[PDB]
């Protein structure tokens, strides 16, 4: 019933993330890491808490993704003096360089899957998703 829906969501999502893993394997970056880079590029900086909500992951998972991305030197963690509560992430110079150079390829990587669709279907899908998500609470 609603089990089928969970499975289809998973299937469509994974197909997306698989083409992204494939396109950046060469660069030594996971699809999760590409996600963060995209989100940091778009926002400049984000709290761990915001990354959790953008990626729909638990704080534990996010903290690991960030530490491994920091170890590769693409992002840095920091705390603003006016806020002892949150930790923040932003790019390093290497990260900025990455996100500039691969803006298109990143954008293309997420798009590849939906080449054959018309905005007809996609708009339909997005409306359904937003409708349903809106009613989850």
Q: Is 30 helix (H, G, I), strand (E, B) or coil?
A: coil
Nearest distance, CB of residue 6 and its own copies, angstroms: 5
Own/partner pairs, 11-20, CB within 8 angstroms, 24+ separation: 15/113, 16/110, 16/113, 19/109, 19/112, 19/113, 20/109, 20/110
Cβ distance to its own copies smaller for residue 101 or 123? 123
Q: Should residue 5 be labelled a site residue for its own copies when binding is judged by CB under 8 A?
A: yes
Angle at 74 between CA 69 and CA 76, to 5 degrees: 80
Q: Should residue 124 be labelled a site residue for its own copies when binding is judged by CB under 8 A?
A: yes
Cβ distance to its own copies smaller for residue 67 or 128? 128
Q: Should residue 15 be labelled a site residue for its own copies when binding is judged by CB under 8 A?
A: yes
Binding residue for its own copies, selected from 55, 70, 76, 92, defined by CB under 8 A: 55
Residues 6 or more apart whose CB falls under 8 angstroms from that of 14 comprise: none
Residues that bind its own copies (CB under 8 A): 1-17, 35, 38, 54-57, 107, 110-111, 113-114, 116-117, 121-126, 128-133, 135-137
């Amino acid at each position: 019933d609603c089990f089928r829906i969970a499975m289809l969501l998973k299937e469509l999502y994974s197909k997306t993330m698989y083409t992204v893993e494939e396109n950046f394997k060469e660069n030594g970056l996971t699809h999760q890491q590409i996600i963060v880079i995209k989100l940091v590029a778009h926002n400049q900086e984000l709290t761990i808490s915001q990354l959790c909500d953008e990626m729909s992951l638990a704080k534990g998972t996010v903290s690991g993704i960030i530490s491994r991305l920091e170890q590769i030197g693409y992002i840095e963690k920091f705390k603003k003096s006016n806020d002892k509560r949150n930790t923040y992430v932003k790019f390093t110079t290497t990260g900025f360089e990455f996100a500039t150079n691969f803006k298109i390829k990143m954008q293309e990587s997420f798009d590849d899957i939906f080449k054959n669709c018309d905005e007809n279907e996609l708009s339909d899908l997005v409306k359904n998703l937003r409708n349903i998500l809106a009613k989850v609470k």
